[PDB]
Symmetry: C5
Subunit: 322 residues, 5 copies
């Protein structure tokens, strides 16, 4: 009866796992998941499968036999969707030795969940993993382990992403508990992800800084030139609003406050202050003309105070986000 | 004949349900639905399945047997789409005791409907549920209940969404009626959803307020400076229109009026009034020059009246939406 | 032989239909279709299915039997895609009476075609329908009718759409002809759709009107102030172009002219005329200065003529679209 | 053995085709394909299917028999994807006469490839076709023809697209060759497509023309008014750039130069020239003041030259694209 | 036993491959893959299939037999997804000779991975390939080769893409190694891709250049005209920011720095310098007036220095990217 495991009713069957990674295929920051494609290999012994031959060598069989015999039942924990490839036929392999020792192999694609934190964006670093477990049988019936310890993961040479840098592949194990069903063995594959920071600098931090620097030119123009100092400020506000809106229309739509938001809105406030300043100056000059009938003090103080405050802001900000 | 239920033609079979939630996977505000992934477990007794063994312990069987025996037929009410996972094999488990007591378990993903009301956006709160029912058999043939009352729902530790905060998981029951078919028992899982309000404040309410404050600077500039007071107002109109359009291009495209729309358009009207004001002043000054051949009264009244009206608006608005 | 209908070779079999609507799920204006989810029920008599029991009561059977017996073959006319739900098992029910009277029931989702006309957008009203027909058998073999006349449609209480208002559900029948195959009976479900008009007013008609009103302020400023009257007009053109582009980027991309387009472009022409007007005035004043070496007539006529023409435009436009 | 065709090893079997079109469903300009839904009908004679009855009339059978008998094997040449509808059961019909004459019918949806050329956009016209061929058997085994010549295509009354106008349905035939396999018979359905040109005119050509006309107003303003003639030109450049960007953000993303691109960029150059012109005038006036210590010649020539060149441009352009 | 290959336990079976390409269907630059549709053909000899006939000619069989006999098991290396077409029936062909020589043919669509480098965008050139391999059997059991050397690839006449130009189709072979399973033979199809460069020039490089040229007009306007020289520069900054944002909103979202980015941001810096320049001039003139109570030197130097630097920039840039 191949509807029962080897040693059914006695001790547990040892089963050993080996993996080779083909590609990482895509990543979603909104949905917090990744997609991966791999080969997965299993090893065990089943004397019911032993056959009388002198060759001492394995024999390859088609995947038709897999529906007749007994076979493990691993599954991918915290997956959203997966499948086995089937063109031009099922991507399945079975090899059996005269002893009854079996090798069993599959090609599969999996989408898996990875919780991410974007509060340090674009200076964040993320770490994800893929988890493998037996569905039906508990550690009292099936023993699951990496077939060669640390050497049981292989990774392909041409793996890459158009938006990320990948590093630090390693494996580990853990024992897990369900309240209604029991204890199981679980295997893990781990890796790390990072970004290209200079791209984001050039695209986001650089224009805003130039705009704040442009708002400081106003302190050096003659206060008598009202039709020249009034349009400059409000046009500068317009430009900065355009820039911020542009950045908002292309972000990955996660709805909480991130490191880059703070920089942008602080720059906005600096430009806004620059526009209240000249109103101060104009009003005071005008009342002086009225009262009676050279650079203003607030101009020559602003020329020092504004840049120094911006420099202090930058020091603190990059002390916090490093 | 496993084409008939236990006790077929006599009283009803009691069946008990247990659930554990793996993840919430996505949410659509336009389509008004959510996606969830879970384990679902069933319990019943069927003496046709009893077997002679002394062990007093359950035996695990593969999912091949499920197509041979009789099994419940639960389904998800108000679902749009669902499926059972099948890699590397069907995610199905069957455990049977010498008595004929059965345990039956599945892993599934479901998309379900949840009517939402966005009229208090972004200050809304939504509540959704998942509903479970038997398709074919009525309460005269099958009795459906939670296996352990309030303790029959478990929820995973690492559940989260990139756009929402989740709280308040609990279960309940109700009896339901179809006019052409009869009465059935129904089980429910309920939960609540909320947003991050400070994000939306900073992104939407803050720029508009700054713009209205910028429009009030005009009352303090000398009415004699026409080429300075005329471009300021119309450029301010341009900036506010840009801001409103930016917000309109990223909203979730539900076509009725919401709490935030009102704020934005009232700010627009304030900026517009500021531009009619100086036209009043300019015209009256000009006719006075003509008639004959110091701050104007309408300027020094506007400096008080405009901010006070905006303050009244804010008081009422936040008394209504709280 | 259940490969032949009841009364095969004699008169036609009467089959009666009953329907209950669960939800409308989505709508596409670009593709001109909608998606709906429903229960569908069939009734007929087949003496081959009669069984000797005294109970005078129906017996419920699983969906395994449906592949053995004979069953109708209805299909959805003018559908793009459909399917039957299958979790946790096929959503199929079979009930049979000792007489051989049968009841047969399904749960399904359908996407169906509905030709729409958007030329009165956003003041349009649309009407769609779902059509049911037998595929293989003609009115000489199968007779199809609503089981209870007008009472054979039920609709759920919690149906709604985030973009539309639904009204006027009713059913009817018609006889249809194919040239190569024959005559068939067809059943219909009809309903109507409408929009929220105030949303569209506030978002589209209101800003444009305010802009046209802003362009009329120019007639009251002193013609001597050239650097004040020249930038006002061209900035107003810029603002109106921004607004029109914003509306164009969010419409449902159907490529013919609609009711709202006309309003927007007529407003554009009014703003454009306002800018040619002052050029007239400036040139004539300048040649008068040259010739020789108070409000201009064209100013004080424009102050009357422009608003009156806009009022006439609005009267005609809302007489046409009502 | 229904694993062999009628007359297997002798001459070829004649098979006749009939088609009725239900809808065209969608079109992709980026991917260069369309989607269509139709009924497809086949006719042939097979004496193995003959049965002893006096009725002289056809008998309708369910689609279960189709997997037992022999049946043609047509397929859709240059398709990307297709399928047969299956709700509430397979959309298949089989009718057989006592003679062994058979009729066989299917309902299907197909996506097919159509190479398009957009270089005359939006003044282009496209022509597409659907191709039908036998997969396995060559013209030495199977003869394929339209069952009634030109009368073998029917088209539904309510066919339409939200973006296109459809005309000119007709059928034809051709003989085709594969180098490794042989000669086959092929059938074709052809049709033509066109656009709504006034929509595109109003949305694209009209604003740009108005902007060029606005740039010519500058030649009539007094050269002494520098703060009035300088901002006008650069604001006009800004407006035209906004318009061009708006059009670029909604086009179907095919990356080569089209008829409308040329118009837009030529208008851009005209506006740019207008801004160099006044610089000429200002500089020359200023050096004259310096040298010494009425309308300028370049103004009164520009007033003639610019519009005439634009008129020449339009004549040539519409002589080329008609 | 057709569960074993020809010559099972002896030497390896030679199998020969032939291919014809129907279309390339789509390309993703973000995901770095392409989609292709083809016919694939196999040749081998199996004496178990030999039959006694004098004809010396092949016999065509339906695809029902393929599930009974033994057949190769090729698969597509570095594919993301694939499938075999099945309407109106499986696109499969089997031809067998009295000898036992077999021909076997399929129609399929494949999506395959191709690593791309965009750092020279839009002046890049990409090269991709499709790889074919046997899944289960190693070079000790199956020998895989092109059936006619270089002549075993055919390509269709009407292949094209709306965004790319295709050239240089050829085939090759390589021997490959897996650490846990052995050595295999692999076949390759290679091709090259290129863009339309003039489109990208006109859309991106041309406007920016015109804007830089517009910023140089300021050096020729009279330094006394402050309300004319101040708004020109800041409006020019606004226009250039709009242009850059427009380009950023339509690029294929790969997050590293490319050839075109550099040009755009260098143009931005040139426009920014032009605005600091006049501030220099204004301040120095003003202090001279104060000190005491003709073209400035910095103006007449800028008129030479700015264009020469831009010309040097262009020379170096196009020496690097050619
Ligand atoms: C930097 C921008 C915002 C962030 C965008 C982003 C954000 C996240 C990510 O994974 C990729 C990209 C690519 C395009 C980027 C944008 C291009 C212009 C925009 O300002
Ligand atoms: C706040 C904005 C409008 C509302 C948008 C929204 C709205 C609903 C939602 O669930 C998420 C988001 C994320 C992006 C938000 C946008 C970013 C900028 C824009 O103004
Ligand atoms: C009203 C707008 C154009 C029409 C848009 C539309 C159009 C049709 C529709 O069914 C829904 C919506 C929602 C978003 C709307 C847009 C929001 C801003 C824009 O101006
Ligand atoms: C005309 C526009 C560009 C071309 C766009 C297009 C282009 C091709 C097409 O098949 C449909 C449409 C609809 C929306 C159109 C746009 C609306 C505004 C924009 O300017
Ligand atoms: C050239 C633009 C940026 C690059 C865009 C692109 C980029 C890559 C690509 O494969 C196609 C296209 C088509 C549309 C292009 C855009 C149209 C306007 C925009 O400036
Ligand atoms: C079982 C075992 O050997 N595990 C090791 C792990 O401890 C180590 O961290 C990793 C490389 O760092 O290699 C592996
Ligand atoms: C059957 C039962 O015990 N139901 C309770 C419910 O009444 C209570 O509200 C909830 C926690 O609030 O816990 C559960
Ligand atoms: C067969 C029949 O009774 N049909 C009626 C129909 O005539 C009527 O219009 C509708 C309600 O208006 O109710 C139903
Ligand atoms: C075989 C045959 O009759 N073909 C004709 C074709 O020649 C003609 O062009 C078309 C209508 O124009 O009608 C059909
Ligand atoms: C096996 C063989 O003949 N291969 C050749 C290859 O060397 C050559 O490069 C190509 C055309 O360039 O044609 C093929
Ligand atoms: C393999 O089989 C041969 C007999 O053919 C035997 O001599 C040898 O010892 C075997 N080796 C192993 C490792 O079992
Ligand atoms: C379990 O079975 C044993 C016999 O093996 C018996 O002694 C014991 O009472 C049983 N326990 C229960 C709870 O049925
Ligand atoms: C139902 O069956 C009972 C016998 O059990 C009979 O007396 C009664 O008349 C039947 N009713 C109908 C409506 O057939
Ligand atoms: C049809 O069959 C009848 C016999 O029932 C015969 O008289 C008649 O000629 C037949 N007609 C044709 C067209 O075969
Ligand atoms: C083909 O078969 C004929 C016998 O029918 C034989 O005479 C001829 O030589 C054969 N040709 C080949 C190439 O095998
Ligand atoms: C490679 C350009 C980096 C620019 C950094 C600017 C930080 C304000
Ligand atoms: C979490 C602190 C946010 C501060 C935002 C300040 C914007 C001016
Ligand atoms: C809105 C600016 C007002 C400035 C007033 C300054 C009074 C000292
Ligand atoms: C932020 C600058 C303040 C300057 C104050 C000057 C008071 C004389
Ligand atoms: C964290 C910033 C909150 C800003 C609130 C502004 C409300 C007008
Ligand atoms: C439902 C009341 C809407 C009021 C909108 C007012 C816009 C100025
Ligand atoms: C459009 C503004 C007109 C202002 C007229 C004021 C007359 C008292
Ligand atoms: C909204 C301000 C009105 C001011 C009126 C002043 C009349 C003298
Ligand atoms: C609820 C606001 C309606 C605004 C209508 C404006 C029509 C021009
Ligand atoms: C079908 C008439 C369209 C008229 C458009 C007028 C635009 C100014
Ligand atoms: C482009 C405006 C020209 C105005 C000329 C008016 C001549 C009476
Ligand atoms: C549209 C206003 C025309 C005014 C003409 C005035 C002629 C003296
Ligand atoms: C229906 C409006 C057509 C406008 C054509 C404009 C051509 C420059
Ligand atoms: C193929 C000729 C393109 C010409 C473009 C001219 C743009 C000013
Ligand atoms: C950039 C404009 C320069 C104009 C110089 C004209 C010399 C005749
Ligand atoms: C394009 C207009 C050129 C005008 C030249 C005038 C030379 C006196
Ligand atoms: C076909 C127009 C090419 C324009 C090239 C511009 C390069 C700066
Ligand atoms: C990799 C060098 C980037 C240089 C960017 C310079 C932007 C001004
Ligand atoms: C921000 C511009 C300052 C210019 C100062 C020049 C001093 C020689
Ligand atoms: C980049 C132009 C610098 C000009 C310096 C002139 C010093 C007299
Ligand atoms: C925002 C600056 C105000 C200065 C008041 C003296
Ligand atoms: C909108 C303000 C008008 C004031 C008239 C005195
Ligand atoms: C567009 C208004 C022109 C007036 C000419 C007198
Ligand atoms: C672009 C116009 C230049 C005219 C020089 C006289
Ligand atoms: C950016 C130009 C500065 C010139 C200082 C003399
Ligand atoms: Cl925009």
């Amino acid at each position: 009866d191949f509807s029962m495991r080897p040693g059914f009713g006695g001790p547990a069957i040892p089963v050993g796992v080996d993996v080779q990674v083909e590609s990482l295929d895509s990543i979603s920051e909104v949905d917090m998941d990744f997609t991966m494609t791999l080969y997965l290999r299993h090893y065990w012994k089943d004397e019911r499968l032993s056959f009388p031959s002198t060759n001492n060598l394995s024999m390859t069989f088609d995947g038709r036999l897999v529906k007749k015999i007994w076979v493990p039942d691993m599954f991918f924990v915290h997956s959203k969707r997966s499948f086995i490839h089937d063109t031009t036929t099922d991507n399945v392999m079975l090899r059996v030795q005269p002893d009854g020792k079996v090798l069993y192999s599959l090609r599969v694609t999996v989408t898996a969940m990875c919780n991410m934190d974007f509060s340090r964006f674009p200076l964040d670093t993320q770490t994800c993993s893929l988890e493998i477990e037996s569905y039906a049988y508990t550690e009292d019936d099936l023993m699951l382990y990496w077939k060669k310890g640390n050497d049981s993961l292989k990774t392909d040479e041409r793996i890459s992403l158009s938006q990320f840098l990948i590093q630090e592949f390693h494996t580990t194990t853990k024992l897990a508990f369900y309240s209604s069903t029991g204890w199981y063995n679980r295997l893990y594959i781990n890796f790390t992800l990072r970004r290209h920071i200079f791209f984001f600098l050039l695209q986001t931090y650089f224009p805003a800084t130039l705009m704040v620097m442009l708002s400081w030119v106003s302190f050096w123009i003659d206060r008598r030139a009202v039709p020249a100092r009034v349009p400059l400020g409000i046009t500068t506000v317009l430009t900065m609003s355009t820039i911020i809106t542009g950045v908002n229309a292309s972000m990955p739509r996660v709805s909480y406050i991130k490191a880059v938001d703070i920089y942008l809105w602080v720059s906005f406030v600096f430009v806004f202050l620059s526009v209240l300043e000249y109103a101060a100056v104009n009003y005071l000059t005008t009342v002086q003309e009225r009262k009676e009938q050279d650079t203003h003090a607030i101009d020559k103080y602003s020329r020092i105070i504004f840049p120094a405050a911006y420099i202090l802001f930058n020091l603190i900000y990059w002390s916090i986000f490093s």
